[PDB]
Amino acid sequence: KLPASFDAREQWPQCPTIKEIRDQGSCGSCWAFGAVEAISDRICIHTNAHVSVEVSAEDLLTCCGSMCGDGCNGGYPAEAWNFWTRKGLVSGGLYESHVGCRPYSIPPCEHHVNGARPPCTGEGDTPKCSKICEPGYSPTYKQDKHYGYNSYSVSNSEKDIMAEIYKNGPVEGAFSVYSDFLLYKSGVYQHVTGEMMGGHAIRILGWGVENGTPYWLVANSWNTDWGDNGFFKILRGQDHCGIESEVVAGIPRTD
Numbered sequence: 001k002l003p004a005s006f007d008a009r010e011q012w013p014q015c016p017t018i019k020e021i022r023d024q025g026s027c028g029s030c031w032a033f034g035a036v037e038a039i040s041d042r043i044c045i046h047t048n049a050h051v052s053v054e055v056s057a058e059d060l061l062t063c064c065g066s067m068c069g070d071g072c073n074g075g076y077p078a079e080a081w082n083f084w085t086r087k088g089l090v091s092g093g094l095y096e097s098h099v100g101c102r103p104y105s106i107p108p109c110e111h112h113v114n115g116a117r118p119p120c121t122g123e124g125d126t127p128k129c130s131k132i133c134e135p136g137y138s139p140t141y142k143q144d145k146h147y148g149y150n151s152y153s154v155s156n157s158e159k160d161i162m163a164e165i166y167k168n169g170p171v172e173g174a175f176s177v178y179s180d181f182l183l184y185k186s187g188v189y190q191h192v193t194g195e196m197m198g199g200h201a202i203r204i205l206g207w208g209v210e211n212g213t214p215y216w217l218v219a220n221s222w223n224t225d226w227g228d229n230g231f232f233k234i235l236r237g238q239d240h241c242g243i244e245s246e247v248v249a250g251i252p253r254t255d
């Protein structure tokens, strides 16, 4: 039944969000980014590409409140997806994209890598919940909401996580970042050196095998100049750094 490799970008080639790497900026909003990325993908899968939208990281980050955590000071996937079922999420693209209702208000920056943008800094304030779309956008904030049918934890089981992605699309996950992860370039990440830095929320969109090493295909929210064009591979099948232990997803409501 399950193929040896799977890439959500190949299964759903008319869903451009699955291909798209975001930049969370100088803000600990990865909990929100992994959610709205996977939700964007699932809305396009659920509709056979008839609805393809960038779901607003801004709307989740700023309007969820204490349910989801402490905004830019961190938060948790499971409550992000619950918020999507209860209040829904509007559209919004990248910083100064003018795409959708609430495009992300926090500028892009360099995440543990060299390049032309300012280096990412800490102590970012969470922006306030603004329940209005950017001037000129149609429809209204309330009309632009996309709701979840449900939210659920996927079991700590490689095969269940594979089947979930294979059937319903990309998922959110979370793992323990050790300092060697920050320098990832290519190949299959395994923790070999360095201290624990903290928990990190990402989007899992496939799996594969590289040099007899089974891996998960994962999107980071650190822009495309980090890692492998913004993606990485991580060891699959041993709950490596807890990669299989905090998987969350949900089914969209037909708008």
Ligand SMILES: *C(=O)N[C@@H](CC1CCCCC1)C(=O)N[C@@H](Cc1ccccc1)C(=O)O
Pocket: 024, 025, 026, 027, 028, 029, 030, 031, 110, 111, 112, 120, 121, 122, 123, 177, 197, 198, 199, 200, 201, 222
């Ligand atoms: C989700 O937002 N995760 C944040 C913390 C991670 C935990 C372990 C170390 C890697 C980072 C995260 O991704 N932070 C971003 C943005 C940032 C940068 C500096 C100060 C505050 C926030 C990061 O690039 O590290």
